[PDB]
Amino acid sequence: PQITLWQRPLVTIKIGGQLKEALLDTGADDTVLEEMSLPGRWKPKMIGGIGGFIKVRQYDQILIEICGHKAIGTVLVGPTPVNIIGRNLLTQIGCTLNF
Amino acid sequence: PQITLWQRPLVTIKIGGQLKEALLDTGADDTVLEEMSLPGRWKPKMIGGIGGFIKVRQYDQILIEICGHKAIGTVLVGPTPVNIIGRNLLTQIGCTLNF
Numbered sequence: 164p165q166i167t168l169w170q171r172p173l174v175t176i177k178i179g180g181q182l183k184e185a186l187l188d189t190g191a192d193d194t195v196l197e198e199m200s201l202p203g204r205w206k207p208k209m210i211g212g213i214g215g216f217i218k219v220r221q222y223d224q225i226l227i228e229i230c231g232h233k234a235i236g237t238v239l240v241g242p243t244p245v246n247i248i249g250r251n252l253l254t255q256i257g258c259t260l261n262f
Numbered sequence: 263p264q265i266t267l268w269q270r271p272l273v274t275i276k277i278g279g280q281l282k283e284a285l286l287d288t289g290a291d292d293t294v295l296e297e298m299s300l301p302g303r304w305k306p307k308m309i310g311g312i313g314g315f316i317k318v319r320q321y322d323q324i325l326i327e328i329c330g331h332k333a334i335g336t337v338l339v340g341p342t343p344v345n346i347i348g349r350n351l352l353t354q355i356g357c358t359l360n361f
């Protein structure tokens with residue numbers, strides 16, 4: 164579909180059998196989700212943006228469905244105020260910026 | 263044009279007669295630039311990122327060229343990691359997300 168930017172680009176995603184609302188963020192290198200439980204081992208990481216840095220847990224090879232499109236990639240889990248779908252996953256669904 | 267997301271969506275902008283690099287950010291409601299001098303009076307504003315909130319200076323009706331497209335709108339100036347072009351200006355140049 165074509166998503167206009169008059170409003171925040173929010174979409175429904177499915178991860179771990181859970182449905183969540185996430186923001187399609189072209190400015191984000193990776194994907195970051197609010198605290199939740201995921202299977203497998205993880206590695207600590209620090210990511211920063213406006214306001215500073217936060218500590219997150221890095222999970223690799225996670226399956227996520229974005230608007231019906233399946234994708235696989237790294238997902239960071241931590242105290243983020245909003246669920247963010249970054250470039251690592253946006254490329255997998257063929258998302259492009261157009262003007 | 264059509265911009266893929268395998269790499270950061272960095273573009274050249276022109277503001278105050280100078281060329282700078284900026285990130286097309288769909289997750290950002292507003293446009294935030296690194297410390298610089300702009301004309302007129304400014305007002306205060308608090309914006310939130312992944313790490314918390316920061317104080318920035320808000321300048322209105324500022325002329326800015328993005329990839330050759332002329333826009334006139336609100337620009338925020340503060341301690342941001344990189345120059346960010348947000349939805350307020352992406353909508354002016356007719357930018358959309360597609361997949």
Ligand SMILES: COC(O)c1ccc(CN2[C@H](COc3ccccc3)[C@H](O)[C@@H](O)[C@@H](COc3ccccc3)N(Cc3ccc(CO)cc3)S2(=O)=O)cc1
Nearest residue numbers: 190191192193211212213244289290291292309311312343
């Ligand atoms: C309630 O909460 C919100 O509404 C809420 C909404 C959106 C965000 C996301 N953020 C801004 C939005 O900025 C603005 C601008 C103007 C007005 C309001 C917000 C932006 O969209 C994002 O792309 C980037 C920008 O940061 C960087 C840092 C370094 C390099 C490049 C970009 N984010 C950080 C980030 C870093 C690393 C990873 C993982 O890789 C993922 C994400 S952010 O700063 O956090 C947070 C909270």
